[PDB]
Amino acid sequence: LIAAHSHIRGLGVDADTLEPRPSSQGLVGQEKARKAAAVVLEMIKQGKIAGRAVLIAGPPSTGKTAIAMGMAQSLGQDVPFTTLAASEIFSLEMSKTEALTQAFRKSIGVRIKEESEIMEGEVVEIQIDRSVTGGAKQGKLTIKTTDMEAIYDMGSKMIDAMTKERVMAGDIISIDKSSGKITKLGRSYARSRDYDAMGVDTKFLQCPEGELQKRKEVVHTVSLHEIDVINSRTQGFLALFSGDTGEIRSEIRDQINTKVAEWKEEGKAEIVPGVLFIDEVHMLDIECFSYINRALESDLAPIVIMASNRGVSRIRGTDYKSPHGLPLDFLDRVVIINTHPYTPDELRQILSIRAQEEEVDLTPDALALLTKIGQEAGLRYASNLITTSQLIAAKRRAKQVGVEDVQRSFKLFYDPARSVRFVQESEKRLIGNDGVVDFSY
Template sequence: MTSTPSTSTSAPVAHNAVPPPSAPSAGRSPRIASHSHIKGLGLTPEGFAAIDSAGFIGQTNAREACGVVVDLIKSRKFSGRALLLVGAPGTGKTALALAISHELGAKVPFCPMVGSEVYSAEVKKTEVLAEAFRRAIGLRIKETKDVYEGEITEITPTEAENPLSGYGKTVSHVIVGLKSAKGTKQLRLDPTIYEAILKEKIVVGDVIYIEHQTGAVKRVGRSDAYASSYDLESETYVPLPKGEVHKRKELVQDVTLNDLDAANARPQGGQDIMSVMGSLVKSNRTEITDKLRREVNKVVQGYVQQGVAEVVPGVVFIDEVHMLDIECFTYLNALLESTMAPTVILATNRGQSLIRGTSDIVSPHGIPVDLLDRCLILRATVEGLKLGAGVTDRLAAQGESSSLRYVLQLLTPALILAQLAGRTQIELEDIGEMTDLFLDSKTSAFNLSKGPGFEGGKMW
């Protein structure tokens, strides 16, 4: 299922959204990790995988299938559904999931975890899963505010005698000069805003904006008038803001539902959902109640209906999913049925396996059959393609041997392939390619049980 935000022409509800924290400094060298070389799926505009591209070598079928999934996610036709990556260790399951996240872009939340993480001594197993899902559901907030924006030309604090004691002085106010393309303005600001300026390490020459209503200060970057001749720098240079210093500006910020949950678990300074967004929990891990999450959902839905916010379903990646037990799988099914559920990518290297938490239930990949029916199973090994006599006959035969739900889930990605080929209807070759890329649970478990040396298989 997918959540498509509705738009209303009514006036936006009033709220005081705190801008998101600034990005970390780019001056620090990135850590070289196992999958640092993965930059994407390495697909052509037509959806075909190059032999050596974006950090991948080979595994073309799997990458092309993931490309179809990326298209489905971007078109909001895959939310609340699951993709299962199946393959022996070292076949690139985690790399494929990471590549999908790169293809979706930084604005789409991506939450990776390992199945064993749910066994925490601090919170319940279901709470760990719920938190991962909420971290993968983004909320893009758009609002128009009165702001003062410009390049800083002056920061002059004015001191006065401390009224609480006879020793020392305190800042009574601060004079800040701002310059834009159409003029300059000198502002007399509160001492608390001066503290925010010091906290953001703002100096003369920086481009900032100050919200008129809340006094929140945001550093945009360094004015490009101060740009040097260096080829590489950690500083971000921005042009001088256009228009007047005092203006109405549309501000966009991206948060997750888990950010809102955590902020409201221990609210500080206000009761409005958006006003406490920045008060994230920094102490010991707190278990958030379902009642609180329902209240957050109600407020979020209100903002969506008012046109203030947009829900952005992201991706949850659960590696070693066979480590989950029957209780987690049952809860996972319930989470997938939510109207705001993200896309779920599961990965495992098990064949026929006992479901954890049971004594006698054996299932493909150690996953309950009802959850497998929700999955498009993408193999990490390649087999030959087989075609039937016709599309209807092919679907009927496939549904008879696997399940009707599996066959129905093949139709949407098959249509994408048909459109890439310039057709408006699904042909037999599209169904054939889909059954080659996405397997039913019985076939994938059988192939995996035969190991990497099975006939027609190839490992990279």
């Protein structure tokens, strides 16, 4: 599916000089902000700096999310990129502080390296002994390559896996002795015909070759929050996915912080600091900000990127207004990146990119009109008309979106400004702020 930021596929900057290109990777304009963001990527990728809070500020639209989403695309898969809407911090399960602590620790990765041994071979024989009316199980697996054959004892856990997988002679299987996962890969020869209900036919494979065992390094990245959850419990690691973690006690996290440092010095773990993107941060309250002040001071703090639309605005949980809706002793810790409203030549480029992403073929006149609509009504509204006009054009079986299709879309769907006028022009027939309304004609 196509979404609001699907065209954004990077930050669009020269990796050498960090110079923003005027158009690249789906981003247009905002060059100062895109350059400032490119520098923050270097701080993230180097990882040495802890707890720098960057605020992207600007009026609505202007790409504050688009830039932050461009950064996510530039960091790639290994680095954590936790996105919070600030409204997620308010919870009934846990305090706001606990919700912030978890989100901070979600943004720090721990890249564990482990070495595992996998078997692979043709099953030549399988033998299982089962107790009558009881759990006791034992068995032996005879397994083969073109160059080895050996008989392995099976425990109860293997026998459960072996029957879940319906391992039969001639199956090619591999077994990771560390995890105990069994996978079938095919068969060395046809499934025998005498028995019925023998299941779906497999792939063919030639027999595996060389040694049965081989060692294999495997790398797993987990957040510090996952480690918190696993170690706060004997049982219930489902809480990692379910929420339901409660307010994890701080003496557990102290221990985890020490152990992760120990794992790092031992070379067991590589710590991978990522970013917490908080969107619409002006939704946090005064207690949240007082916590974040000092969460940033840890050497395990991620870099925290924030976005706000707000002018001078009231701080939540507070009597008084402040710039961005953020308190001043918080803003003392924060550098601000400013986004700016677009030029018509930028809107034309952005709309062209949206049209390509949505696979919509605008005529040049339709693009000109959409650009003009974009100046009067906003970039989002004009981008919605692209999809609408495509549909309307298709119903009349036109090859391309014409001005006629854009005009009809504009006719059908109200500009956020026209809707405000419509609301004013029917103040008596809409329900007021004091609840009065008239239903009569």
